[PDB]
Amino acid sequence: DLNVEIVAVERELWSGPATFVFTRTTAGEIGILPRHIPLVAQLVDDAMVRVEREGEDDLRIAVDGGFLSVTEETVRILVENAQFESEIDADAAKEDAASDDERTAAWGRARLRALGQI
Amino acid sequence: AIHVGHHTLVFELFGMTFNGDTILATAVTAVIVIALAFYLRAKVTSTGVPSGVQLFWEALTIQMRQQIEGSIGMKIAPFVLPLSVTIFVFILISNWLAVLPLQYGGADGAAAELYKAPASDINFVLALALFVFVCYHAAGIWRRGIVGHPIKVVKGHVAFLAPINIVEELAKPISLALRLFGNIFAGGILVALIAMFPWYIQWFPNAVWKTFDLFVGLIQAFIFSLLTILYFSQSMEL
Amino acid sequence: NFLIPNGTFFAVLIIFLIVLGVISKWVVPPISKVL
Amino acid sequence: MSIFIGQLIGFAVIAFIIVKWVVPPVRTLMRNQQEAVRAALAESAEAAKK
Amino acid sequence: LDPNAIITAGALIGGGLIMGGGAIGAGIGDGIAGNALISGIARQPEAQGRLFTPFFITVGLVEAAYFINLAFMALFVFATPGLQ
Amino acid sequence: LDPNAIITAGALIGGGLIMGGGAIGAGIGDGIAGNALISGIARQPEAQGRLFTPFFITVGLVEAAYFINLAFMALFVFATPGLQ
Amino acid sequence: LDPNAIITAGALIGGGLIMGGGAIGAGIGDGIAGNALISGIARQPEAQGRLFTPFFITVGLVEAAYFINLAFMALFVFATPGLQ
Amino acid sequence: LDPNAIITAGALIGGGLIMGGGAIGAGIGDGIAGNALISGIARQPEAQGRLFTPFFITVGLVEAAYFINLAFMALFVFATPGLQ
Amino acid sequence: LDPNAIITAGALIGGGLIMGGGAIGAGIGDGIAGNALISGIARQPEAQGRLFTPFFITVGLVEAAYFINLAFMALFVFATPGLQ
Amino acid sequence: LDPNAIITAGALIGGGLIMGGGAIGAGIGDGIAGNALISGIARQPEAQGRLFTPFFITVGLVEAAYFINLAFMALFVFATPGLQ
Amino acid sequence: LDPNAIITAGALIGGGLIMGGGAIGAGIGDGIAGNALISGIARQPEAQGRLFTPFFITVGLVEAAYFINLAFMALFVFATPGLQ
Amino acid sequence: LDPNAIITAGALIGGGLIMGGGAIGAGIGDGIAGNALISGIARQPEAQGRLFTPFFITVGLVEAAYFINLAFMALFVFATPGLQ
Amino acid sequence: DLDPNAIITAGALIGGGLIMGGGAIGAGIGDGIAGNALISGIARQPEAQGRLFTPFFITVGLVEAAYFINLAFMALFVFATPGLQ
């Protein structure tokens, strides 16, 4: 198990042991296991994060301004903003998707991906 | 039959043979170049709108000057700017004039050409390569001294690889010539092969080959010019 | 044989020289001045 | 002279391809450069007048 | 038994070797240079402007190994050395 | 044993070599250039349009070499030099 | 020796070389283009839909060369030039 | 010398070339595709299954290519063209 | 000269080519697959168990070809096709 | 001009091919595996303990191919099949 | 048969081998070095002069090997050792 | 012709092929291992001290191959098996 | 009779040609790969060129060594041909 800690600018969002972390950096999709080598990658503009933990359904997090950092024993995602799946509104993301602002579109697409609508 | 290496107007003077076809091709190319030069000079406008010929010449000059400055100080080697550029245009014309439809029958079925690119004659490429070799070796002598320049070149970038440097130097001239030679020699041969086909089969492959040979000739002139500038910069340092 | 160098080696060379003269006195210096 | 006819047809095809595809873009580039230099001259004259 | 026959057979084999080796080298080198050029152009568009300069140089250094050999092929196939 | 038989055999061998080398070079160069293009398109989709330009230059060289071989092999087999 | 025997032996050897080179080039180039496509799919699965457009073009030519070679091999072992 | 003897010797050498090239191509291409698949899985293990469909294509197109050679080698060494 | 002598010499040459190509292909494929596996293990050690699932396939599909070559080698060097 | 002499010459050529192909494959595969290992150790100086295992597996496969070729070349040269 | 004919045919084949290997090596090495140079230029626009010197060292070594082959092939063909 | 004459001709050609393959393998493999070592030193200067440990082993596994081939040259040339 | 000396000479010449082909391929491609590594290193670390020369040459050394070894053996094949009668 690896200590995942999603941390926002304003506060610390969530932490705990997990079994696997799936995200999407600028290069491409990436999966992090307990003993992944050190890494410092920028999450894609519309990145989403899936955390697979023991004895609990996968956590889907919509992320804004992510910056994944993998250490020998920790994984920290630095999100300018975040939203758990329970807190995302499908209607809001669908309506605001593909707006005149690129960052708004990225956040809406991250919300959609977290919802699994894709 | 193809009969590679054939020549016409071959004659002798001073007890030395001359290939008339190569002389005629080179004379035609030089005449075209000089006509373009004088057309520019007559109609060169520093203030008014420049004509197409002026655009062409200034583009060539700008490119050559850019490479010269990047590789070496432009102020250090002014004479490189003309030499380089002229080579380019020379070779370029020497190749592009081959596009003209001058392929006919020699009464034996073998293709005969009124104009063959001089590069297909080893003498032309050898002359150009040896001329550039002597030019930049003399420039290296000038900028490093009569004895220093050989010392530096044999020493090279790293001293204890002196033997390779020797070969390196000998690689520069011949590599410059043969490369160009082949790039044209193939074409000089290749068209003849298509000439074995009938007209209704010769039109298409010849068309495609010459369409690509235009680009080949342009690329080869460019390569030779940049390699000449590169060797000049290499031989004139410190 | 064809690769063997011939006398024309000099003749073509001579032509090249005069081309330089045309490009070093009527094309390149004026163009540099213009630019 | 059948090969002469074939190579003449090939040259005609090459010239047609050139005029159809290559000549227009290079003509556009020449026109762009001519217009750019003309605009530079006009703007310099306007700046001197100003 | 007609020695020139063996001479020309050996010359044809040699020219085949010339062309095969040269073509392999040229194809591989040009493909590698093109891969470099395409990747560089993918990295940023503007870089293309300066990429064609070294790229062509690479091609100039690559195709030579082909065409140099090409010349020898003709020397082998048409003006066969030691043809007797 | 007519010498022209030996000449034709040697020419066929030379053509086989020429085609083998040309095929190897063309195939591998095409593979490398296409790998570069595919990776570029995968990474930046909006680069698609600007990637097909350099690629076709690379092919324009690679394939060209192949064609040259294709011609010379013919010269070997259909116009065997020195057949006499 | 029957001259046709030497002719056909040489032609069959040439066809063997043609197959060898064509297969080498096809296999290597197709594997490289594949590697590229698989890397694109793994890195960015969304690219899959648009990745077939370049890839099949790349592989599309890779086979062509090989297939072209194949044709000439049929010419060598069925219509051997110079056969008597 | 029996003509069929030399003809069949040439056929055997040609088949040897055919399989040599085919095995080389298959090995290189399969290894490269496997490298791509292994790297992709290493970067994203859960993508494993999704990568089999693309992978099987290139392998199914590389290995398949090699198989053609096998078939033709039969024609070379079991029904030899121009076998007197 | 006994025709079977020429037949056996050609067969031995053919088998030598079989193994040359097969060993080259197998060695290069194993090297490339091993490079991919080593890189993956270095990157994601805990994925090792998963990474062996595709690796064994690729090797299992590369060496296969090599072993296939071995088979036909015997057919060349032990039961020579076309032998008299 | 003993048939044994021709068969032995063919066997020697075949064995030379065995060794050449095996050496090429072994050298290149070992170099590639070592490149992977070196990169892994440079990036992770503490990972050599677990990196040596896949590297050893790859080297084992490559050397197995090389030694199989060695054994078959010995079979050729020392006990030539088909020789009378 | 003429001993000189056999000697010079062998010389021509050996020279073809020398030049084929030299061309393959030179082309591939120049391509790889040019790929390195082009990648460096794309990454760093201003590293042009700095990247000249090592690229020229590499190309110098490659062309030195190539022209050593050229000199030795010229020796082989024009002044063949053991020519009696 | 003396049987030992053709025996020794075949032996010379086989040894030449053995050394050709060995040289190709050694050069390619050690060049790749070098590339690895230079890259590692560029990324981690101090790691040089430890990087020489795996590198040598790699070179060993490559160099050994070449040297083994070298030995067989003697076994092929100075003491040709099957000579009579 | 075919003058066995000619057979030996042809075989030795072909063997030397094969030796050169292999040696040149190996040396050229290995030098190209090592130079690629050196160029990339200098591009990434402009001030490391000297530090890069030490390993680079070492690698190149061994590469060239193989070539030179082949060279030596070719000198035996063409001039001091073994097995001559």
Residue numbers in the entry:
A (entry chain H): 3 to 120
B (entry chain a): 10 to 247
C (entry chain b): 23 to 57
D (entry chain d): 1 to 50
E (entry chain O), F (entry chain N), G (entry chain M), H (entry chain L), I (entry chain T), J (entry chain S), ...: 3 to 86
M (entry chain Q): 2 to 86
Which passages does the manuscript contain on this structure?
As do other ATP synthases in eubacteria, chloroplasts, and mitochondria, the enzyme couples a proton-motive force (pmf) across the IPM generated by respiration to the synthesis in the F1-domain of the enzyme of ATP from adenosine diphosphate (ADP) and phosphate by a mechanical rotary mechanism. The mycobacterial PS is made of two proteins, bδ and b′.
Substates S1a to S1e are in S1, and S3a to S3c are in S3. Further round from S1b by ca. 2° lie S1c to S1e, which have similar c-ring positions to each other, but there are large differences in the F1 domain and in the PS. The positions of the top of the PS suggest that the order of procession is S1a > S1b > S1e > S1d > S1c.
